[PDB]
Amino acid sequence: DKKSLYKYLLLRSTGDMHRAKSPTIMTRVTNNVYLGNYKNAMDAPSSEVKFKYVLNLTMDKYTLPNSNINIIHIPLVDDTTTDISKYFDDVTAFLSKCDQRNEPVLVHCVAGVNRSGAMILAYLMSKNKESSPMLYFLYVYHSMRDLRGAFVENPSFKRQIIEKYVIDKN
Amino acid sequence: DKKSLYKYLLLRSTGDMHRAKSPTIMTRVTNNVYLGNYKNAMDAPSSEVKFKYVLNLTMDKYTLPNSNINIIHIPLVDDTTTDISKYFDDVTAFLSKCDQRNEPVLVHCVAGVNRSGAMILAYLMSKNKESSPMLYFLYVYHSMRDLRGAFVENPSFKRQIIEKYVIDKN
């Protein structure tokens, strides 16, 4: 319902947010795209999800030595100010292909909140063309944060998302 | 700037709000409409503003015995759940006339935050037809709150505003 949706988003946007809680388990974001922390990445070969890809956004190249997973490494510095905007289109195009091929992919960083959360937020914004960008940003942000406990908490990352995906009509 | 505006509103809406601070001084909201607490109402006859009206939303009828001010009394119960929506159109039509006649009016309650703040928020929403209601609600709410320190903190009042002024396009 529009009335329930607007009440939810605007109360969340004017003072009613939960304290941030560190996510521990993997979240299915779309049909094939998943969001997680570093433990979730270590557990990916053992997951019932038949992951074809893991997108590793940490600084460290790792291997999953007994796994057929293709680990794509895009190192993002562990900083509250990382230039993630340079990677938005490359990452969302990759995630869109995974959804188009039904090739499950886990996007992760260390805590599964900021670097990986921001790329998931970018992907969802890029997949939207029905809802106004402002409304959709507030909906995705608050509903993902309620689900995960913490989601793109870094103000610089939110700012970069806003500047990329919310300034233009869509 | 659209980019600066969206950054401001959406960062305020996703976790970056100040602690609530009780307002002490009167705020000029429009050309003729002012917002204040109970002390501001007591001080209204002495104000350099030549108030023609005071809108008293407290439960108590008072007089300003050495003053030509017309005190309009609409008692609103001191409750977090008061049905303010019944009074929206009556109050905003009255405030709109004060602006049309250049007849200054002070809207006040006890703390100048919730009952009076909500009627000011309703009035500003009713005066808007250019900006989308969602965007304008977030702009007025956060900018008034930053100015006053506390502004429509009661969730029931925000909900009633949202249901009245934000659900429809405008």
Of the candidates B25, B33, B29, the residue with the CA atom closest to the CA atom of residue B52? B33
User: Chain A contact for B90, CB < 8 A?
Assistant: no
Contact A142 B14 (CB under 8 A): yes
B125/B133 Cα distance (integer angstroms): 7
Q: Please, what sign has the CA dihedral across residues A94, A100, A105, A109?
A: positive
A142/A146 Cα distance (integer angstroms): 6
Q: What is the resolution of this structure in A?
A: 1.8
B119/B160 Cα distance (integer angstroms): 11
**Cα-based angle B164, B56, B114 (whole degrees, multiple of 5):** 45
Strand partners, A70: A53
User: Chain A contact for B13, CB < 8 A?
Assistant: yes
The residue type found at B96 is S
Strand partners, B24: none
Q: Judge contact between B106 and B54, C-beta under 8 A.
A: yes
B61/B82 Cα distance (integer angstroms): 18
Q: Is residue B98 among the annotated active site residues?
A: no
Contact B14 A167 (CB under 8 A): no
Helix (H) / strand (E) element for B34: namely: strand B33-36
Contact A141 B3 (CB under 8 A): no
A1 burial level (CB within 10 Å; 0-12, 13-18, 19+): exposed
The residue type found at A10 is L
B37/A83 Cα distance (integer angstroms): 46
A62/A43 Cα distance (integer angstroms): 13
Q: Judge contact between B13 and B26, C-beta under 8 A.
A: no
End-to-end CA distance of chain B: 21
Size of interface A-B (CB pairs under 8 A): 69
Strand partners, B73: B56
Q: Judge contact between B105 and B52, C-beta under 8 A.
A: yes
Pull the structure tokens for residue A14: 């004017």
Q: Are strands B53-56 and B70-73 parallel, antiparallel or unpaired?
A: parallel
Could you please report the per-residue DSSP string of B82-151? ---GGGHHHHHHHHHHHHHHT--EEEE-SSSSSHHHHHHHHHHHHH--SS-HHHHHHHHHHHHHHHHS--
B137/B122 Cα distance (integer angstroms): 9
Of the candidates A164, A70, A69, A59, the residue with the CA atom closest to the CA atom of residue A115? A59
Q: Judge contact between A13 and B155, C-beta under 8 A.
A: no
A58/B37 Cα distance (integer angstroms): 52
B6/A164 Cα distance (integer angstroms): 11
Buried b / exposed e along B67-77 (16+ C-beta atoms within 10 A):
eebebeebebe
Task: Give the SS3 label for residue B36.
Answer: strand
| Mutant choice from B1, B2, B9, B13 vs A, greatest count of A C-beta within 10 A | B13
Q: Which chain A residues are Cβ-neighbours of B10 within 8 angstroms?
A: 134, 137-138, 158, 162, 166
User: Which residue, chain included where needed, has tokens 């106004």?
Assistant: A132
A101/A98 Cα distance (integer angstroms): 5
A59/A3 Cα distance (integer angstroms): 44
User: Chain A contact for B135, CB < 8 A?
Assistant: yes
User: Chain A contact for B11, CB < 8 A?
Assistant: yes
SS3 string of chain A? CHHHHHHHHHHHCCCCCCCCCCCCCCEECCCCEEEECHHHHHHHHHCCCCCCEEEECCCCCCCCCCCCCEEEECCCCCCCCCCCHHHHHHHHHHHHHHHHHCCCEEEECCCCCCHHHHHHHHHHHHHCCCCCHHHHHHHHHHHHHHHHCCCCCCHHHHHHHHHHHCCCCC
